[PDB]
Design a binder for these strands. Structure first.
Ligand SMILES: Nc1ncnc2c1ncn2[C@@H]1O[C@H](COP(=O)(O)O[C@H]2[C@@H](O)[C@H](n3cnc4c(N)ncnc43)O[C@@H]2COP(=O)(O)OP(=O)(O)OP(=O)(O)O)[C@@H](O)[C@H]1O
Ligand SMILES: [Mg+2]
Ligand SMILES: [Mg+2]
Length: 252
RNA sequence: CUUCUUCAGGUUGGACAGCUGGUGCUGCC
Protein backbone atom coordinates (compact mmCIF):
# COMPACT_ATOMS: atom_id res chain seq x y z
CA UNK A 1 0.00 0.00 0.00
CA UNK A 2 3.04 2.29 0.33
CA UNK A 3 4.27 4.19 -2.72
CA UNK A 4 7.76 5.30 -1.62
CA UNK A 5 9.49 3.09 0.92
CA UNK A 6 10.92 -0.39 1.39
CA UNK A 7 9.53 -3.90 0.93
CA UNK A 8 10.40 -5.00 4.47
CA UNK A 9 8.20 -6.27 7.30
CA UNK A 10 8.67 -4.37 10.56
CA UNK A 11 7.74 -5.76 13.96
CA UNK A 12 7.56 -4.40 17.50
CA UNK A 13 8.17 -6.09 20.87
CA UNK A 14 7.42 -3.61 23.67
CA UNK A 15 7.94 -4.86 27.24
CA UNK A 16 7.39 -2.70 30.32
CA UNK A 17 10.57 -2.51 32.37
CA UNK A 18 10.55 -3.49 36.05
CA UNK A 19 6.81 -4.08 36.27
CA UNK A 20 7.44 -7.10 38.49
CA UNK A 21 9.58 -4.86 40.68
CA UNK A 22 6.87 -2.19 40.50
CA UNK A 23 4.59 -4.81 42.08
CA UNK A 24 7.13 -6.21 44.56
CA UNK A 25 8.23 -2.83 45.94
CA UNK A 26 7.09 -0.11 43.53
CA UNK A 27 3.80 0.56 45.33
CA UNK A 28 4.37 2.16 48.77
CA UNK A 29 4.11 -0.13 51.78
CA UNK A 30 1.95 2.40 53.63
CA UNK A 31 -0.44 2.55 50.65
CA UNK A 32 -0.82 -1.21 50.29
CA UNK A 33 -4.33 -2.59 49.77
CA UNK A 34 -6.04 -5.30 47.77
CA UNK A 35 -8.24 -2.68 46.10
CA UNK A 36 -5.26 -0.48 45.17
CA UNK A 37 -3.27 -3.40 43.75
CA UNK A 38 -6.33 -4.53 41.80
CA UNK A 39 -6.82 -0.96 40.55
CA UNK A 40 -3.23 -0.77 39.30
CA UNK A 41 -3.45 -4.20 37.67
CA UNK A 42 -6.74 -3.46 35.90
CA UNK A 43 -5.53 -0.01 34.85
CA UNK A 44 -2.43 -1.52 33.26
CA UNK A 45 -4.38 -4.30 31.53
CA UNK A 46 -7.05 -1.91 30.25
CA UNK A 47 -4.33 0.47 29.08
CA UNK A 48 -2.60 -2.26 27.08
CA UNK A 49 -5.57 -4.01 25.47
CA UNK A 50 -8.24 -1.34 25.20
CA UNK A 51 -6.05 1.69 24.56
CA UNK A 52 -3.83 -0.09 22.04
CA UNK A 53 -7.02 -0.96 20.15
CA UNK A 54 -8.37 2.59 20.41
CA UNK A 55 -5.05 4.27 19.57
CA UNK A 56 -4.73 2.19 16.42
CA UNK A 57 -8.40 2.81 15.56
CA UNK A 58 -8.07 6.58 16.06
CA UNK A 59 -6.70 7.06 12.53
CA UNK A 60 -5.42 4.96 9.64
CA UNK A 61 -2.61 2.72 10.91
CA UNK A 62 -1.24 -0.18 8.87
CA UNK A 63 -0.80 -2.42 11.91
CA UNK A 64 -2.13 -5.96 12.42
CA UNK A 65 -1.43 -6.36 16.16
CA UNK A 66 -0.83 -9.95 17.22
CA UNK A 67 -0.79 -9.64 21.01
CA UNK A 68 -1.34 -6.94 23.61
CA UNK A 69 -2.41 -8.75 26.80
CA UNK A 70 -0.32 -7.50 29.69
CA UNK A 71 3.27 -6.22 30.13
CA UNK A 72 4.04 -7.33 26.55
CA UNK A 73 3.34 -6.24 22.99
CA UNK A 74 3.69 -7.80 19.54
CA UNK A 75 2.99 -5.98 16.29
CA UNK A 76 3.41 -6.66 12.57
CA UNK A 77 2.74 -4.08 9.90
CA UNK A 78 4.23 -1.56 7.51
CA UNK A 79 7.84 -0.73 8.35
CA UNK A 80 7.29 3.03 8.45
CA UNK A 81 4.12 2.42 10.45
CA UNK A 82 6.14 0.49 13.05
CA UNK A 83 8.72 3.28 13.19
CA UNK A 84 6.21 6.12 13.52
CA UNK A 85 4.04 4.21 16.00
CA UNK A 86 6.98 3.42 18.29
CA UNK A 87 7.13 7.12 19.21
CA UNK A 88 3.35 7.23 19.65
CA UNK A 89 3.56 4.20 21.94
CA UNK A 90 6.37 5.71 24.04
CA UNK A 91 4.63 9.07 24.44
CA UNK A 92 1.29 7.45 25.28
CA UNK A 93 2.93 5.16 27.84
CA UNK A 94 4.70 8.15 29.39
CA UNK A 95 1.43 10.10 29.53
CA UNK A 96 -0.64 7.26 31.01
CA UNK A 97 1.99 6.06 33.50
CA UNK A 98 3.13 9.61 34.40
CA UNK A 99 6.75 8.79 33.46
CA UNK A 100 7.13 6.17 36.21
CA UNK A 101 7.61 2.92 34.27
CA UNK A 102 10.25 2.36 31.60
CA UNK A 103 9.54 0.50 28.36
CA UNK A 104 11.82 -1.23 25.86
CA UNK A 105 11.19 -2.25 22.26
CA UNK A 106 12.87 -3.91 19.30
CA UNK A 107 12.27 -3.59 15.56
CA UNK A 108 13.36 -5.98 12.84
CA UNK A 109 13.16 -5.91 9.06
CA UNK A 110 12.06 -9.15 7.41
CA UNK A 111 11.18 -10.32 3.92
CA UNK A 112 7.72 -11.43 2.83
CA UNK A 113 8.60 -15.10 3.46
CA UNK A 114 11.03 -14.85 6.38
CA UNK A 115 10.49 -17.52 9.07
CA UNK A 116 8.06 -16.05 11.57
CA UNK A 117 9.60 -18.11 14.37
CA UNK A 118 12.97 -16.66 13.35
CA UNK A 119 11.30 -13.24 13.19
CA UNK A 120 10.10 -13.60 16.77
CA UNK A 121 13.40 -14.98 18.08
CA UNK A 122 15.46 -12.23 16.44
CA UNK A 123 13.07 -9.54 17.64
CA UNK A 124 13.25 -11.05 21.13
CA UNK A 125 17.03 -10.98 21.27
CA UNK A 126 16.99 -7.40 19.96
CA UNK A 127 14.50 -6.69 22.74
CA UNK A 128 16.96 -8.19 25.24
CA UNK A 129 19.75 -6.04 23.77
CA UNK A 130 17.44 -3.10 24.49
CA UNK A 131 16.79 -4.44 28.00
CA UNK A 132 20.50 -4.66 28.92
CA UNK A 133 21.40 -1.05 28.03
CA UNK A 134 23.75 0.99 30.22
CA UNK A 135 25.36 4.34 29.32
CA UNK A 136 28.16 3.54 31.78
CA UNK A 137 29.40 0.23 33.21
CA UNK A 138 29.60 1.41 36.83
CA UNK A 139 26.10 1.30 38.33
CA UNK A 140 24.43 -1.95 39.36
CA UNK A 141 21.66 -3.36 37.13
CA UNK A 142 20.71 -2.04 33.69
CA UNK A 143 18.62 1.03 32.93
CA UNK A 144 16.45 -1.18 30.67
CA UNK A 145 15.15 2.01 29.01
CA UNK A 146 16.29 1.59 25.41
CA UNK A 147 15.20 0.49 21.94
CA UNK A 148 17.17 -1.60 19.45
CA UNK A 149 16.71 -0.51 15.85
CA UNK A 150 17.17 -3.48 13.45
CA UNK A 151 20.38 -4.67 15.15
CA UNK A 152 21.33 -5.99 18.57
CA UNK A 153 24.40 -3.74 18.61
CA UNK A 154 22.33 -0.66 17.66
CA UNK A 155 20.90 0.06 21.11
CA UNK A 156 19.49 3.58 21.01
CA UNK A 157 17.36 5.20 23.73
CA UNK A 158 13.99 6.91 24.12
CA UNK A 159 15.37 10.02 25.89
CA UNK A 160 17.13 13.10 24.48
CA UNK A 161 19.10 10.58 22.39
CA UNK A 162 15.99 9.50 20.47
CA UNK A 163 14.93 13.15 20.48
CA UNK A 164 18.17 13.99 18.66
CA UNK A 165 17.84 11.11 16.20
CA UNK A 166 14.27 12.06 15.31
CA UNK A 167 15.08 15.77 14.99
CA UNK A 168 17.91 14.78 12.65
CA UNK A 169 15.59 12.47 10.69
CA UNK A 170 12.98 15.21 10.26
CA UNK A 171 15.61 17.78 9.26
CA UNK A 172 17.18 15.42 6.71
CA UNK A 173 13.76 14.55 5.29
CA UNK A 174 12.87 18.24 4.93
CA UNK A 175 16.23 19.25 3.45
CA UNK A 176 17.27 16.35 1.20
CA UNK A 177 14.01 15.80 -0.68
CA UNK A 178 14.97 18.39 -3.33
CA UNK A 179 18.64 18.27 -4.30
CA UNK A 180 20.02 18.88 -7.78
CA UNK A 181 18.90 15.23 -8.21
CA UNK A 182 22.41 14.54 -9.54
CA UNK A 183 24.77 15.45 -6.71
CA UNK A 184 22.81 13.16 -4.39
CA UNK A 185 25.07 10.25 -5.37
CA UNK A 186 27.37 11.34 -2.52
CA UNK A 187 24.83 9.96 -0.02
CA UNK A 188 25.81 6.32 -0.50
CA UNK A 189 29.44 7.49 -0.58
CA UNK A 190 28.99 8.93 2.91
CA UNK A 191 27.04 5.87 4.09
CA UNK A 192 29.59 3.29 2.94
CA UNK A 193 32.53 5.38 4.14
CA UNK A 194 30.96 5.97 7.57
CA UNK A 195 29.67 2.37 8.01
CA UNK A 196 32.42 2.16 10.62
CA UNK A 197 35.15 4.59 11.61
CA UNK A 198 38.05 2.68 13.16
CA UNK A 199 40.15 2.29 10.00
CA UNK A 200 41.73 4.43 7.27
CA UNK A 201 40.48 7.93 8.08
CA UNK A 202 41.89 9.45 4.88
CA UNK A 203 38.72 9.01 2.84
CA UNK A 204 36.55 10.65 5.52
CA UNK A 205 38.59 13.86 5.60
CA UNK A 206 38.78 13.59 1.80
CA UNK A 207 34.97 13.60 1.58
CA UNK A 208 34.97 16.55 3.97
CA UNK A 209 37.30 18.39 1.59
CA UNK A 210 35.10 17.43 -1.37
CA UNK A 211 31.99 18.76 0.38
CA UNK A 212 33.88 21.99 1.03
CA UNK A 213 34.95 22.04 -2.64
CA UNK A 214 31.40 21.68 -3.96
CA UNK A 215 30.54 25.30 -4.84
CA UNK A 216 27.53 26.46 -6.85
CA UNK A 217 24.23 28.28 -6.31
CA UNK A 218 22.27 26.08 -3.89
CA UNK A 219 21.00 26.14 -0.29
CA UNK A 220 24.57 27.24 0.36
CA UNK A 221 26.97 25.58 2.80
CA UNK A 222 24.92 26.06 5.98
CA UNK A 223 23.55 22.52 6.01
CA UNK A 224 26.37 21.33 3.75
CA UNK A 225 28.66 22.13 6.70
CA UNK A 226 26.09 21.05 9.28
CA UNK A 227 26.63 17.59 7.81
CA UNK A 228 30.29 17.90 8.82
CA UNK A 229 29.35 19.34 12.21
CA UNK A 230 27.09 16.34 12.88
CA UNK A 231 29.62 13.97 11.27
CA UNK A 232 32.05 13.99 14.23
CA UNK A 233 30.19 14.30 17.54
CA UNK A 234 27.35 11.99 16.43
CA UNK A 235 28.78 9.11 14.39
CA UNK A 236 26.39 6.24 15.15
CA UNK A 237 23.53 8.73 15.51
CA UNK A 238 24.23 10.15 12.06
CA UNK A 239 24.47 6.73 10.41
CA UNK A 240 21.27 5.54 12.09
CA UNK A 241 19.26 8.65 11.22
CA UNK A 242 20.64 8.61 7.67
CA UNK A 243 19.75 4.94 7.18
CA UNK A 244 16.23 5.57 8.52
CA UNK A 245 15.90 8.49 6.10
CA UNK A 246 17.18 6.37 3.20
CA UNK A 247 14.76 3.53 3.95
CA UNK A 248 11.86 5.97 4.25
CA UNK A 249 12.74 7.82 1.02
CA UNK A 250 14.07 4.93 -1.08
CA UNK A 251 12.34 4.73 -4.48
CA UNK A 252 11.49 1.06 -3.98
C1' C B 1 96.30 45.88 -45.56
C1' U B 2 90.69 47.01 -40.03
C1' U B 3 85.82 46.40 -37.83
C1' C B 4 81.65 43.76 -35.34
C1' U B 5 78.16 38.18 -37.50
C1' U B 6 73.48 40.19 -33.34
C1' C B 7 72.61 42.22 -28.46
C1' A B 8 69.10 43.27 -24.77
C1' G B 9 63.41 41.98 -22.98
C1' G B 10 58.85 39.42 -22.82
C1' U B 11 58.34 32.28 -22.83
C1' U B 12 52.24 31.93 -22.44
C1' G B 13 48.18 35.41 -19.47
C1' G B 14 43.03 35.12 -18.14
C1' A B 15 38.01 32.37 -18.63
C1' C B 16 35.46 28.05 -17.67
C1' A B 17 36.36 23.03 -14.94
C1' G B 18 32.30 18.20 -14.96
C1' C B 19 27.16 19.00 -15.43
C1' U B 20 22.05 16.68 -16.19
C1' G B 21 19.00 11.59 -16.31
C1' G B 22 18.47 7.21 -14.60
C1' U B 23 18.95 5.25 -9.74
C1' G B 24 17.30 -2.87 -8.17
C1' C B 25 13.02 -4.66 -11.23
C1' U B 26 10.91 -9.34 -12.10
C1' G B 27 10.28 -15.24 -10.34
C1' C B 28 10.26 -18.37 -6.38
C1' C B 29 9.37 -20.48 -0.28
N1 LIG C 1 -0.72 -8.16 41.66
C1 LIG C 1 0.34 -8.84 41.21
N2 LIG C 1 0.29 -9.36 39.96
C2 LIG C 1 1.36 -10.03 39.51
N3 LIG C 1 2.51 -10.29 40.12
C3 LIG C 1 2.53 -9.75 41.35
C4 LIG C 1 1.51 -9.03 41.96
N4 LIG C 1 1.88 -8.64 43.24
C5 LIG C 1 3.09 -9.12 43.37
N5 LIG C 1 3.55 -9.81 42.27
C6 LIG C 1 4.84 -10.47 42.10
O1 LIG C 1 5.47 -9.93 40.95
C7 LIG C 1 6.21 -10.97 40.25
C8 LIG C 1 5.71 -11.06 38.83
O2 LIG C 1 6.45 -12.01 38.08
P1 LIG C 1 5.74 -12.93 36.99
O3 LIG C 1 4.87 -13.89 37.72
O4 LIG C 1 6.79 -13.45 36.07
O5 LIG C 1 4.46 -12.57 36.19
C9 LIG C 1 4.48 -11.75 34.98
C10 LIG C 1 2.99 -11.22 34.62
O6 LIG C 1 2.00 -12.28 34.86
C11 LIG C 1 2.78 -10.21 35.42
N6 LIG C 1 1.92 -9.20 34.78
C12 LIG C 1 1.96 -8.84 33.48
N7 LIG C 1 1.06 -7.91 33.26
C13 LIG C 1 0.42 -7.65 34.42
C14 LIG C 1 -0.62 -6.76 34.78
N8 LIG C 1 -1.23 -5.89 33.80
N9 LIG C 1 -1.02 -6.76 36.01
C15 LIG C 1 -0.47 -7.56 36.93
N10 LIG C 1 0.51 -8.40 36.63
C16 LIG C 1 0.97 -8.47 35.39
O7 LIG C 1 4.21 -9.60 35.70
C17 LIG C 1 5.21 -10.64 35.19
C18 LIG C 1 5.84 -10.15 33.86
O8 LIG C 1 7.19 -10.59 33.80
P2 LIG C 1 8.30 -9.65 32.96
O9 LIG C 1 7.60 -8.97 31.77
O10 LIG C 1 9.41 -10.54 32.43
O11 LIG C 1 8.93 -8.51 33.98
P3 LIG C 1 9.75 -7.19 33.49
O12 LIG C 1 9.11 -5.97 34.08
O13 LIG C 1 9.71 -7.10 32.01
O14 LIG C 1 11.31 -7.27 34.00
P4 LIG C 1 12.60 -6.72 33.10
O15 LIG C 1 12.87 -7.72 31.93
O16 LIG C 1 12.25 -5.32 32.53
O17 LIG C 1 13.80 -6.61 33.94
C19 LIG C 1 6.04 -12.24 41.09
O18 LIG C 1 7.12 -12.34 42.01
C20 LIG C 1 4.74 -11.97 41.85
O19 LIG C 1 4.61 -12.70 43.05
MG1 LIG D 1 7.41 -6.67 31.43
MG1 LIG E 1 6.57 -10.20 29.77
Amino acid sequence: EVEVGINRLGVLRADVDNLGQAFINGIPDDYLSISRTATFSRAMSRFFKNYLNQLLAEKSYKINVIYAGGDDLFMIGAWQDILDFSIVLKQKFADFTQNKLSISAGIGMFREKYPVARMASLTGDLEDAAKDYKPDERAVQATKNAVTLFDATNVFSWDTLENDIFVKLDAITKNFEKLDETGKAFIYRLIDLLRGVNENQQINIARLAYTLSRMEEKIGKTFAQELYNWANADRKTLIMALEIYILKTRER
